A and B are shown apart, each in its own frame.
Chain A
């Protein structure tokens, strides 16, 4: 019975779960970003610009309408950097679990 391959099986499965979390956050990042550019291009401030918050609406400037989407893109991208900071940490154990099968 080997407990290092018990760590080796846990290590490779943690590689898989991290990369999938990056991909779903990248598609949400471009979805908000391309939602910014389309609504600015059509009809800036003429009388009022209604903006959806559920089923009630607020009327204000065109650039503030982007600004709510701009913040969520900032929060999402900082996660993507932190996700890849965990993708890097799951690779260092992978180079070291090969020796620990010979050590203990």
Chain B
């Protein structure tokens, strides 16, 4: 049993929580200096946001684990705001840390935390505007503008308007709850930057040419789908078979009987009713003979990750087992199509009985400019599918954060004693998302903040900074939108973790 107490324990928790906030400080921004993460796995892992990287860390500080668990709690609800709870609570602890040796060893701050965060969440929904049907939108221009907001970050000229209205349609078809991975955009070699295809079901990227591959049907009215799990080939078996010889007709029997069992592999589920043969594992040269002879379609080396999306929308499952091979495990569609885009045979699964995976398929014949398009779209989905869930949408981009810091140094004057130093530190931490994006877009980051406060001493409407227009503006009039509730959840979560860690200056351990 070990223990450490007091202020030298407590400040050690603070600077431990600073370093993880030094990491994620602009990971909601697209930029920084990268870390691929290799563990005892030995495998390469990168990310675009910090929350996936925070899932990779085995934290060594238990006080820093608490800031993780609040941020993961923010991550568990929406999938976003993980960074926002992280940075605000640490810069609280950054400014409080000199005051502790000044005598903020009492927990007088914890009354100042709540009185700050009650006023703030009463401003967020108040300044936010409720709109779904047509209050300023077209029932679609809400989802069009936010998608054009995300696709204006990278310099797509006018196709970003064409790319917007397509990915609007993928959200409305799928919409059951805030989930984005079924919409996941498949990078397609081939196609153009002018054509773009939405799929109501799933699709398979690659399938290879076997014997009689084009002698298998392309048009279905109901694909009876078998999502098999095994590899077929003649060279998977080993031979020891024996019987007596009195002629050369016995020579035909030993080879043919080892092929009927390979033909027995397929006929069990084909007589169950299945017509579509799918395996992420290869199909044999002799095994694909019977597949063209069955006149039922097969597709080998399909993606297993794409094979999992077939299980949801089609009512299917994983396949061949020792028993229970019936129509209860098969998947269904209504339309099969195979459109060779680029040089790959690209399959269409649409007409699914369940709206459980509505993906959008982007083309262009590229890898780099298309990845520029996808990552903007992956966050465009995160805005608009949440914009359906909450009718009241506020402006993002630090528009309201600078407004709160205007509101609270005023409130610091009304607050007496040591707690106003909290509110001065509370208004201090709010600028942290402007502090990164000004240096990301390229600005004297502090002098921007000085400019935004004058427009809150004179206006105070939506004034923040732009990273995509690269200036200062009203971010609602710059159309940077996101629903206000996740901010209210972030304001509560950042206040909760910050008051908790400072409440512990005494930590009890057991190395036994």
Give residues in A with beta carbon < 8 Å to B.
Answer: 1-4, 85, 87-89, 91-92, 94-96, 98-100, 102-104
Contact = CB atoms under 8 A, between A and B. Distances in A.
Contacts of B323: 104
A96 B322 contact: no
18 contacts: A3-B322, A87-B242, A88-B242, A88-B243, A89-B243, A91-B242, A92-B243, A92-B257, A94-B240, A95-B239, A95-B240, A95-B241, A96-B257, A96-B261, A98-B237, A99-B237, A99-B262, A103-B261
Given A91-B242, A96-B261, 16 more contacts: A4-B322, A85-B244, A88-B243, A89-B242, A91-B241, A92-B241, A95-B237, A95-B239, A95-B241, A95-B258, A96-B257, A96-B258, A98-B236, A99-B258, A103-B261, A103-B268
Contacts of B230: 102-103
B321 A104 contact: yes
A3 B323 CA distance: 10
Interface residues of B, number: 25
A101 to B, nearest CB: 9
Interface string B229-269: 01110001111111110000000001001100110110010
B117 interface: no
A80 B444 CA distance: 98
B468 interface: no
A87 B244 CA distance: 11
Interface of B: 230-232, 236-244, 254, 257-258, 261-262, 264-265, 268, 320-323, 325
Contact of B238 (A87, A89, A95, A104): A95
A100 B265 CA distance: 8
A11 to B, nearest CB: 10
Nearest to B262: A99
Nearest to A92: B241
Indicate the member of A1, A94, A104 with the most B CB atoms within 10 Å: A104
Contacts of A95: 237-241, 258
B237 A2 contact: no
A73 to B, nearest CB: 22
A88 B320 CA distance: 31
Nearest to B254: A92
B242 A92 contact: yes
Nearest to A87: B242
A34 B134 CA distance: 109
Contacts of B241: 91-92, 94-96
A99 B265 contact: yes
B424 to A, nearest CB: 67
Contacts of A99: 236-237, 258, 261-262, 264-265
Indicate the member of A4, A94, A95, A102 with the most B CB atoms within 10 Å: A102
A32 B242 CA distance: 30
B365 to A, nearest CB: 38
B261 A100 contact: yes
B240 A91 contact: yes
Contacts of B240: 91, 94-95
Contact of B236 (A3, A96, A102): A102
B322 A104 contact: yes
Contacts of B320: 102-104
Contact of A102 (B231, B254, B257, B258): B231
A103 B237 CA distance: 12
Nearest to B237: A98
Nearest to B242: A88
A1 B257 CA distance: 27
Given A102-B265, A103-B264, A103-B268, A2 B322 contact: yes
Nearest to A81: B244
Indicate the member of A88, A94, A95 with the most B CB atoms within 10 Å: A95
A100 B262 CA distance: 8
Nearest to A99: B261
B236 to A, nearest CB: 7
A103 B258 contact: no
Contacts of B236: 98-99, 102
Contacts of B242: 87-89, 91-92
A98 B239 CA distance: 9
A71 B403 CA distance: 113
Contacts of B265: 99, 102-103
Nearest to A94: B240
A102 B232 contact: yes
